[PDB]
Design a protein around this nucleic acid. Structure first.
Ligand SMILES: Nc1ncnc2c1ncn2[C@@H]1O[C@H](COP(=O)(O)OP(=O)(O)NP(=O)(O)O)[C@@H](O)[C@H]1O
Ligand SMILES: Nc1ncnc2c1ncn2[C@@H]1O[C@H](COP(=O)(O)OP(=O)(O)NP(=O)(O)O)[C@@H](O)[C@H]1O
Ligand SMILES: [Mg+2]
Ligand SMILES: [Mg+2]
Lengths: 341, 341
DNA sequence: GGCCAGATCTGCCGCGGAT
DNA sequence: ATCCGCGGCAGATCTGGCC
């Protein structure tokens, strides 16, 4: 796509009226507590994204109605997106008519690279496994249905199994029915995902990076549930299934959650986001818009040049931070208002 | 006190043999993956602290012998500490004779400021309570004993309650004593930790900081237990007690886990660590050594000027980062070795 | 060698936002 | 009105430290 115009009314501490991004790479500079995060967050929400914060904290102090408006231009045709926050919830108007948030799933959208994306690379097992589930669900709508259906059957089987025992064969059949499909989809996705991550991180650094998926029921879910009946009966839980897998990111053959430093995990997080951005371009046909917050804070001079040189080949990108990249147009944010010369 | 010497043998990527820090304020400059965090972590461990990492990941790749040696000088007299990490575990020598690790708890020690101290401010409900508990436990052992006793008594009471009902009145009285002592000690500590925090944060920024503790059994544990009898019986869990408190950090009157930016959160975390350092120095008699990692990574010029101006008045402190503070001695780390001008 | 502290992990229940 | 995805809380297994 190509963003044309952004307009807001009483969104967080913002005090602007209109913002027109230029084509190609851009920049934003400022001091602490000025509103770079607020502006990027508003641009992300205007195109149909998600935010960690609740909708009651996204309105100005003492008001009840926020309004965001953005205009985009694609080959298909021009669009106008209207958002209206408040107490009842969101209200989206695509081109002038009320419509649900789900219909925007087909549009390219945007990609937001933020500091909290770094806590999945070096986080606990649950968080690492949860990161992959919501990434595959962005490309296939069938994966989410299977993932939601498997959980109900697992819970019912475990609840029955806590009560001594019964003819629980049917729940075993259902669990085996869903787990095999889930595992096959995961393998199929990672087979495509690994080479792009390998060849993207090789342009920002030197060492190689990879993935390893440790499976528990790889040969068969039912043939693994039959092989652990005594221990499962004694313990009272289902100990085998896709809900117990492991994902680890490797740096030169070592786990990244125990050996990697901070400026070395930041590059892995950015490479993961950039590899996701590339695949969505082939899936949709038009690459999304890239938004990066604090692009070069925790990195040294060698890495910053590589990031800045990679980011300049994209159709459109916006970087924000305390310092101005050299050679690119620069805006400024002062107490919520954006002004450019 | 003072730190006079530091020597190692096969501790992570470090390859130095001796390192002598000058009195006053020092610095360390390096690129990514050079050994700044490793050096600070080694000093912190050698002086008698605790490290988040595991003891099997702290040894050089391919060996099972780690050695840490440090020489200090207290007002009473000089000391000498040595460490040895291997398969059996940690081993500590004090002037040539073995001693348990609990003995070093009386010595002043050190204070470490790290990026994962920022998760307490912006973290969930339980993490802030855990931070408060482990902060209070560094000034008294009665708190630890009461915590353990109360936890065990509550676990037994819940186990009994989940299976029908019995003479619970014998179990309400034992829990009430520990709960009352715990809440009294918490109030006593927070009545003194707040003015110091406000005064310290008033020198690094402009806004105001505060603390708020919300209690479910302020009037009395027995009264609340009697009041919530029907709910406890129906749900099956004790819904009232010191294990259900809130700690909220306020910036100009609003909670910091929602209405706050990155720089303000960093300043809050640093102010909390400095307040703990000052209180601990008052408690023992000699302020502990201060170690700061990436002091000024995500701050503007004014905030890090203020931080440097404050740190210039300490008996001994060491700062590390990608850049140097103007006007202080510096040392450079390359490939794991340290060379001073 | 043995057993108590104590932080880490996994499944269950109730709550908040969309269709 | 109802399913969906989620934050908060309690419980059990593990490894390492002290007697
Ligand atoms: N809903 C809101 N209404 C009004 N002010 C708000 C709101 N949310 C946040 N703020 C204020 O906005 C400021 C921080 O905004 P923010 O967008 O994070 O700045 P920033 O560009 O991110 N600075 P930085 O710390 O470098 O990231 C603070 O003064 C907050 O109190
Ligand atoms: N057990 C180990 N044995 C040998 N090398 C190790 C070990 N653990 C980590 N390393 C190396 O140490 C590097 C990072 O060291 P580190 O001390 O974090 O540097 P740093 O000063 O923190 N650089 P920065 O990324 O800015 O924090 C890793 O990239 C590894 O190459
Ligand atoms: Mg921000
Ligand atoms: Mg580091």
């Amino acid at each position: 796509m190509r963003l044309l115009l952004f307009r807001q009314r009483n969104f967080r501490n913002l005090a602007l009226e209109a913002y027109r991004p230029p084509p190609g790479l851009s920049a934003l500079v400022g001091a602490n507590a000025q509103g770079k995060t607020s502006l990027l967050l508003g641009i992300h929400l205007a195109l149909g994204g998600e935010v960690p914060l609740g909708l009651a904290d996204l309105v100005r102090f003492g008001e009840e109605e926020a309004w965001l408006h953005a205009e985009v231009e694609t080959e298909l045709g021009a669009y106008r997106l209207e958002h209206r926050l408040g107490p009842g919830g969101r209200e989206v108007l695509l081109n002038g008519k009320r419509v649900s948030l789900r219909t925007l799933w087909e549009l390219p959208g945007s990609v937001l690279v933020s500091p909290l994306d770094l806590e999945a690379v070096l986080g606990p097992k649950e968080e690492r496994r949860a990161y992959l589930d919501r990434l595959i669900a962005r490309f296939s709508r069938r994966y989410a249905a299977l993932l939601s259906a498997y959980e109900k059957a697992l819970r019912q089987r475990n609840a029955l199994l806590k009560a001594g025992g019964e003819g629980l064969s049917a729940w075993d059949r259902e669990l085996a029915r869903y787990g095999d499909e889930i595992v096959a989809l995961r393998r199929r996705f990672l087979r495509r995902f690994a080479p792009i991550l390998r060849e993207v991180h090789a342009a920002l650094a030197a060492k190689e990076a990879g993935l390893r998926l440790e499976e528990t029921a790889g040969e068969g879910v039912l043939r693994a549930l039959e092989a652990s009946r005594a221990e499962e009966r004694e313990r009272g839980q289902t100990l085998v299934g896709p809900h117990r897998d492991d994902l680890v990111f490797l740096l030169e053959g070592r786990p990244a959650h125990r050996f990697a430093s901070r400026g070395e995990a930041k590059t892995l997080a950015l490479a993961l986001r950039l590899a996701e951005h590339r695949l969505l371009g082939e899936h949709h046909g038009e690459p999304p818009l890239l938004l990066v917050d604090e692009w070069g804070e925790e990195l040294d001079e060698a890495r910053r040049r590589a990031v800045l040189a990679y980011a300049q080949a994209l159709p459109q990108a916006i970087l924000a931070g305390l310092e101005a990249p050299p050679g690119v147009p620069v805006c400024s944010v002062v107490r919520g208002v954006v002004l450019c010369p």
